[model samples]
Target chain A: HNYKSLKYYYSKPSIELKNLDGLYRQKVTDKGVYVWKDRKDYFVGLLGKDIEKYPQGEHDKQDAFLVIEEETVNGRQYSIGGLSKTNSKEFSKEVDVKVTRKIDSEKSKDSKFKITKEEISLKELDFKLRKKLMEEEKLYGAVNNRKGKIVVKMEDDKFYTFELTKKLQPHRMGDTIDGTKIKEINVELEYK
Target chain B: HNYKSLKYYYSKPSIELKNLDGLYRQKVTDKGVYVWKDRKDYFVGLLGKDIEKYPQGEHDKQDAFLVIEEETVNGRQYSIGGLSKTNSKEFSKEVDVKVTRKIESSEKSKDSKFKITKEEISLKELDFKLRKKLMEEEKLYGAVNNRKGKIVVKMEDDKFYTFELTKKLQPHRMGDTIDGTKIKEINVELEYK
Candidate 1:
């Protein structure tokens, strides 16, 4: 767990916490995981710091993150797009989450993502339609470990659940930043 | 001619004579007639006394009426609702016209008439609908005649239809205080030029 390696970005504010019932805009941010019958995977776009613990998900407050929830429901997986903070504070329990390490520059040539700046910026958003800025205050925070593991905190009663997995890594081969990661990030709806 | 013996309760206002050009609201005030294979029979929903000289239709300040043109087209006789006032005012000529007198009072008891004081005048009385009151007024009352009949102004290079139906005071039955002159028996006409 370290704070020297992270980034935090501006995001859709807390107004989002209100009336959390919805199916907002959906678009594949980073195409990670699967051929239909693949592991449970998804991406999250938020302003967060890396946490060092048993399991969970981000850093650079990864202004933009491709988090994968490793939780399996009846042998299945689903994605989550928005980020949430449970009002529950003290009762924090350890939950293993997946984090796919960004591919290295020397090893990654031309690969999977046919991503675009337009799609990254305009494709999908929810609520006040306020955009998560491509910019954020970078901060190095404590993360469980790099490469394939991150930490997530599950509370007494939360609408979100966390887990761990190595089934997929959806980030691009990448830039000069965040050259480290182990597996994937798994944060999704609280699946019983 | 018979101002003391008439009813001017249901009708299309003569103020409709203004520069009318487009669509408007429609409602069947009264149902009239349809004859077998005829293109000249029509009904009028205007009121006034009558016109001796006719080149087209209406005059003597016709008020409420529902006259349908009994024309047959496509094996159908659909009455058009709403009225129109075309833009040509130069080829107007007086043509002789005829009007069938209203049925005698005792013979015409309670008739089929579903009139409304609401649509006729409201936005002017109701709460603000966030629009100009005048716009709503013009929209509702200014429909191109419908159901019973529609007014069409046909102007050709050689022949067009037009007639001075009225230009002044019309007649009506004795009322509380509105004792207007001459019993109104006016119907609107489509002037062909």
Candidate 2:
């Protein structure tokens, strides 16, 4: 070999997270509060729930679970992940995702940006109880107590778009037995 | 491993020869012919004394031999070869270098161009008898022949400067002869192309 011993080698490592800050949330209704099954929900789950909880810190909390599901959309497999609420959005933003094997290489090409759509369930926390606490009367009120769901969708044809859904509910006064009911809510956002 | 049991390999062979033309040669004189021991020599050798009866091309035939010797000018080692009178210029152009040891990378860094000095041997052929027969009329009629010794030197200063040392002897007629002597005739050239 001619001068083969002179060769050298080098390498580096990096990590990336998908940002779903204020895109999807749980909306409160007169009947109950439900987490919006949107695109941002999938992104948050795939990037890990800790990514959303500790947007700036290195907290080791397992905030969400990621599930990838394949849906035949126009002859191509489209992956979507489901995000479910866990413990009340109060002390933490714990969520869970039901993973599926429908995801393909093309859909998950940008492991940094793509979110697979799958079924998700939040355990250890009751959506109804969380909605009731959110109804408690206060300045920040139920909105502060209940976690919101933001859906960021990386659509096949449209690219990245998100919907922010917030549940508006009234909390009962201190010591009152009357259960609080959800009121008007709003969902608004455009592709970003 | 992901694919089937097919694999790919490659092989290649190459041949090369340098062309040496327009070379000059000097004749051997009463003095001894100077030649490095390792120099390559090509000439015609006759079995009998009838070599003079035939013309240049009609001789017994041409043969070649290599001389072996170790010499040190500075701190480097070089192998020398010898050549004879009847050798053709074309045969002298072919030379192969045999490196005894690996050249250190640091030594190569001294200069982009590195050169190895080589000594050429003369007077190995064209002895006193032949010189006298070819130069009977002229008192000092020692003419160089068309054959020569060529040495390739890789320069250490300029990347493009490669030196080719060619020692050629003038041609001599059939009747001329020298008393048997060797002389140093150096012709060095720097080439880049």
Candidate 3:
């Protein structure tokens, strides 16, 4: 008998909301955002019609993350919390992948650039959001704000932000398997 | 509970003893030679002094291996049999290393000649793929199949001979066969001189 198993973590910085629409507003923090499914109506039911003011803080901070944690046992990794880590490390740059698999291509195989992708709920980005991953010496992995902007630092040391198209969402389930499903958009990336 | 463990092996092919001096003698096989700790004397104890002959077979086979087997119980591997596998995989060709550790250097890192340095009394010209197998953590227990190699041997006549090995040098572990697995000759022409 032998002792085994090790834990690993993946976290990202989120963008904070600058303006609050008052009562039932989105709560933002450095770790992530507190989602309010029905902000106005839910709060109105609790505090009455006259209620206007709500909790507020100085803006310009963030946590729009899709954090994932996993454990390795018997040479295989299984996610213990949130979403499973994707095959982002294998990809060179902007190459579309299907869920957990890499679509083999000469271009993706040769490039040296690196990127990361994560799956999160609509609430993680927030109901209403703003801002982008600004310039930096090196890019930190993140899926920031309502638009689900994917940002990464390429080998060239520049942050590349990619837009998430509407065609991406509403993840679908596999026809053969009842529980298994695929992410609507696995990863959106840029090289230049 | 996560029960994790792994097994590892290091093996070498033998050079067949071309001229067996006879039994009640040096019994040689491809896997290795049976170390008759005291050949004639030990046999003499078993048989009467009147005996002049003993078991014999077509000769020219060998096994001079410094085999080692290890197992990973926790995160680290511990040798369970023979000598532990060396750090020969780390050193570039021709660079001498300590018993189990590599001497750090830039030269060792850049050279890609990839000679395997098994701890034999005086053996050289090991295969590149065998050394490559040593470097790969996943395939440590298995043979590096279908690779060409040669073995250099110093004979009793104080001369050198080279033999060709057609396939991989099978690793040595308990309950495994060691016969007919030497890096023997591939071409009859290259087998001599």
Candidate 4:
């Protein structure tokens, strides 16, 4: 028995009223319910003081919201609205139309994740090593038994493992192992 | 037969020679040997170019050397001088003497080594942990899993163990354990030392 603006059209700076759809009118009149699980969706329908009238499941018995059905609030758009009220025989008159449900059977289900292995130079490795020792010293402020490992693959296809120590030597860039020069380096670190 | 000026003594370089010790004179004459186990003792006797004539154990004969019997090169001293030669009876005479050997067993034998344990504080422990992590991060330029252990003994009978972590929490200085407060801390360090 209460009058409510159930539907409206909003343009840049103006607004208009639209006739409520039959199914929506029927849904509101018969069940008196429309649940918005996300509150932001519910908030967009309010104006000024109407924000306080936010639909609280059973406490609200009115059309407390309208959803933007086309375009968006930034421009011209149509919104769907109607009374959301308790079941009452006074608004149940129907103009019936058959509605069918559709299924999507051809959807594919495959996904992937990729990780890339990294390459490093001996000079860079040495720099990293020095930094690590400094950092650990800064972290604990005490002497520690910290160590790191550098795996070097030389041009000759040989793998050389070097222990990263707190003491740095002068020839890291010119470092040689197994009588062969470094081509690639991989450093392994530790955590406390 | 060779009239060599073979012996001399020095009173501040004003020289003279004592009669040669008989047994030494005989041994030199018979074996032509007087080996110097240490060369410094030989060097002290040289007076200049004679430094080259250092007893090579051979090649040179006659007392190309002398032994200071007392005092040193620094002051007044007497030196023994004589011919060190291949067996010649001209230096031997009927001068016989007796010598004896003695031994002592009173010396004792014993020795030892020791290592002392160290103590650390939780505040200091936290500092060390922070430094360790920083060192590793700088080492590899990637992620790492480094850990350390701290053993804390409470005033009570319980022992509390803590993990030394890189993350420095404000509570470290006020760190507590097993519902009790930290009393003693010990840290273990590493070597690439």
Candidate 5:
């Protein structure tokens, strides 16, 4: 029986903490799985550094804060941000914000990744796998840690859950998830 | 004997009066006698009226009494005073005073009555003649009366004095003064030639 279904997903409902770590990672996808369907996926994240923690204690002021929110519409990924006025007197105020698309640099050499479906799925899956690896391996080396949560809801009102146990490395031609080996699969399977 | 000498004579210190047969001769020349070169002549009867009294009825409510004065300078005669500031308020308060030398209609055929002279001398002569005529005739007439006194003071002198009586019908004409005419003559012989 072929099941015509839709999926809903959300990340863990807890605040992700950060310290001397450079950046925090969170997975945002349009599909119910680690990879999105044929549609493009986009994510929004906020990054801030406490200027007061600097040894010299000098704060670089900004005129405005930009809040970038990414979303997909009609299978095309786009980034939008809000321009906020920075309150210079409030030390906790966000000084600046910028939205950047995760572009595939290798796609220039390999036409396979150049396609929109490939590019989007490659980015989403890579993020999810890396996060899993960080959790399991506890390799919190850089300022930005590959740690996050995911939530998936199926159209049949059923749900699935998972957590990172080992630090997931970049797929080096021999990585597997749930006994299914990592391979270049068409993004259409997520929706079907 | 054509002996002539310049001399200064003073006028009598009184107003002259006369009575006509029946008519009131409001205009009258003073009756006086003058002597020169041992000749005495009575002023006798003045041929012309002097003090003309325009009955008060004949004057406008704001009208003023006017007089005429004549003077000779550079052989030219000038008459002044029909319109004088003392006689009328209009003349005194005038903003721009102008004296235009207009040729008389009669002069178109004969000699021109209009004369041109220095502005200063013209103004002085005009005022001097006006005062003399007013005092002697006691009547203001528009025409230049030769019988009136002629003021001939030097242009350089600030004090003005009546020099002599007019010599002829026209004040500018030359004539000899009768020996004892009871007239006051001051520097008369010094004619402006």
Candidate 6:
């Protein structure tokens, strides 16, 4: 996990968390907080309680991230133990998604804005469509987190819609039966 | 334990065995997987069992998959699984598709209160309440007990829900001939007066 973010940290500013459209939390680094879930967001601390949050370091002087030791890549990282390899790589951000999306509060964990990696959950769309489907308008699909720009490319039904139900869980018109969209955000969106 | 090929498959990541074309195979754990034919052809891909081109047992291990998934109702899965459950979440797309078609799948399932005759379906036949309701509805449009085989339920001019009656369900017919459970079109409301 050798990248530039660690070498020239403060000198290497990131827009990942600073100007995010939706809710976000600081990703911890020995140097400082980077952004919410970055490419090399493998920072770890003692105590289970501190796993989810990050420490924004401005002491200005930062400590070298704990990296037990790194000489080669033979799964020895496990053997060496202790320090985690660091990836200062810029958080790669670009995702493809359905044409429509749902907007929720900054705090909502499952808001589309925060988690736009659309997944095919609940249903695996089968156009060879069964007879029972003749009666359903929209189907259920999940949003797997994809790191890209949302793109809609359906020959028919090019657009989609969604709504926020319950605790800001976003439901959008998508097309898959992949993984379950996380329930941190408890919303069941339906498409138009 | 059965088929020798898969016993040591994950040992080999990708293979280029002959014969298998658009069909590919993967090795899953004690999941009881059926490789698309494992690298070893002439095998059903699972259970190390009675070998063949396909399967006999049912417990199916299921894909790279392209999904059409039927109707509004209609959806398509692009990327999935990790076999990483990955793809870091991106921002949402800001736009809309044709509003009318947006509701295509949902509306098609919701709007049709009547089971229109498509291929094989049944409908309510000759309901007295429907006939009585039609008597009052006739002031708007006239309907009758047309004993014709073709029962017409129209929107305006289009017979969206037409029930072509079988001879038994038809009064002019039912020559007191047939018996047993025959599929008949039941009726609710008549359209064209």
Q: What lDDT score goes with residue B19 in model 4?
A: 23
| TM value for model 1 | 0.13
Off by over 4 Å in 2: A1-67, A71-85, A88-192, B1-193
TM-score of each: 0.13, 0.11, 0.15, 0.15, 0.13, 0.14
**How would you encode candidate 5's per-residue C-alpha lDDT over A20-137 as one tens digit per residue?**
1121121111111111222323221111111111211111221111111112212332211111112323222111111111233211111121111211122233333333333432
DockQ of all models, two decimals each: 0.00, 0.00, 0.01, 0.00, 0.00, 0.01
| lDDT tens readout by residue for model 4, B1-193 | 0001011111112111122222111111111123232232221222112222323234422222233332221222322222222222222212111111112222331122111111212222233332333344322112232222222222234554533332222221211212112233222222111
Task: Write model 5 residue lDDT over B1-193, tens digit each, in one string.
Answer: 0011010101212111111111111211111111111231111111111112221111221111111111121122212111101112221111111111112311111111212121111222333333343334332222333233344332223343344333212211111121111112222221111
In candidate 1 the C-alpha lDDT for residue B108 amounts to 21
Fill in the DockQ of model 2. Answer: 0.00
Model 5 DockQ class: incorrect
lDDT of 1 at A73: 18
Interface RMSD of candidate 3?
A: 27.2
Tens digits of per-residue lDDT for model 4, A33-102 = 2233333222121211221233322443232223233212212232222223322222321111111112
CAPRI tier of model 2 = incorrect
Which prediction has the highest lDDT against the true structure? 4
- Listed for every candidate in order, the interface RMSD values in angstroms are 38.6, 43.0, 27.2, 60.8, 66.0, 29.0
TM-score of 6: 0.14
RMSD of 6: 26.9
Q: For model 4, what share of native contacts is present?
A: 0.00
Q: How well does candidate 3 score on lDDT at residue B168?
A: 23
The CA-based lDDT of model 1 is what?
A: 0.20
True A-B contacts kept by model 3: 0.00
Relative to the unseen true structure, what is the C-alpha lDDT of residue A134 in candidate 5, on a scale of 0 to 100? 37
Candidate 2 chain A lDDT trough over 10 residues, lowest sum: A2-11
Per-residue CA lDDT of model 3 for A80-165, tens digit only, reads: 11111222232322332321212242122122212232222232321111112122201123322112244333334443333432
Cα displacement (Å) at residue A156, model 3: 62
